[PDB]
């Protein structure tokens, strides 16, 4: 659900990094 | 790094660039 999340809500790097180390 | 909404392919491409390998494994052969 990450695509719709980011496309509506700006992904901060702190959160975005949590998806992939 | 620009904090952007990143829709579609741009999201998985930016995430691949920052994580560095071992994420997303697909290429078309049409």
From Swiss-Prot, chain A:
It comes from the Eukaryota. This is Insulin A chain. Coiled coil: none annotated. Disulfide bonds join 6-11. The lineage of its organism: Eukaryota, Metazoa, Chordata, Craniata, Vertebrata. The chain holds residues 90 to 110 of 110 of the full protein. It comes from Homo sapiens (Human).
